[PDB]
A paper describes a structure:
One group of metal ion efflux transporters that regulates metal ion homeostasis and can be found in all domains of life is the Cation Diffusion Facilitator (CDF) protein family. One of the most highly conserved and abundant integral MM proteins is the CDF transporter MamM. MamM was recently proposed to function as a magnetosome-directed iron transporter required for iron biomineralization since its deletion abolished magnetite biomineralization and mutation of residues within the conserved TMD metal-binding site resulted in alterations of magnetite crystal size, morphology and even mineral phase. To summarize our results we present an alternative model for the CDF CTD mode of action, in which we propose that upon metal cation binding, the CTD induces conformational changes towards a tighter and more compact fold which allows the activation of iron transport through the TMD.
Each MamM monomer (residues 215–293) adopts the metallochaperone-like typical fold of CDF CTDs whilst the C-terminal tail (residues 294–318) is disordered and could not be traced in the electron density map. To validate that the disordered C-terminal tail have no effect on the domain fold, we determined the structures of a C-terminal truncation MamM-CTD mutant (residues 215–293) that adopted a similar CTD fold. As observed previously, the decreased number of particles per cell was at least partially a consequence of a substantial number of cells within the population that remained non-magnetic (10–20%). These previous studies also revealed that transcomplementation of a truncated C-terminal tail MamM mutant also allows the formation of wild-type-like particle. ITC measurements of the CTD single point mutants and the C-terminal truncation mutant revealed that the binding affinities remained in the same order of magnitude as the wild-type, with some alternation in the number of binding sites.
Numbering used by the authors:
A (entry chain A), B (entry chain A): 213 to 291
Write the structure that this text describes.
Amino acid sequence: HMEAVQNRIVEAAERVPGVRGVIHLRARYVGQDIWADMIIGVDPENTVEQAHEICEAVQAAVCGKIRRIESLHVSAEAR
Amino acid sequence: HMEAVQNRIVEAAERVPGVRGVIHLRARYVGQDIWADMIIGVDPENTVEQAHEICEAVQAAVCGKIRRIESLHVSAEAR
């Protein structure tokens, strides 16, 4: 039930330009809502500002596809 | 007592090349040891890899100056 949602989250993140994998995804229910935290991989040669833009793009992409999510935080690490 | 340690932490971080402020510092005692978490500001045009190197440098600088610290995590955001 949750694994199906986790899979949809990872797939949505991986379709955003600049994502080099999902390093980490924590997702849990608060009532019927999902609260999640994730770390994406990015090109180490991207700027801090570009990494920020990719994170934002993932947040928007994931939240737009998975409507039960009411909190999502995305950070980036080199990969 | 803790504020004096927090001040030493911020000052140690600010002396590392590439640090553009301390955005966030949480520090608490676990017994006599300090466990801390901090966010530094960095140039948005630095690479992800450079930001990583600055974080490492801050970790080493802070831990070397403040000997009671037994856990320190450092991350970076644009500023």
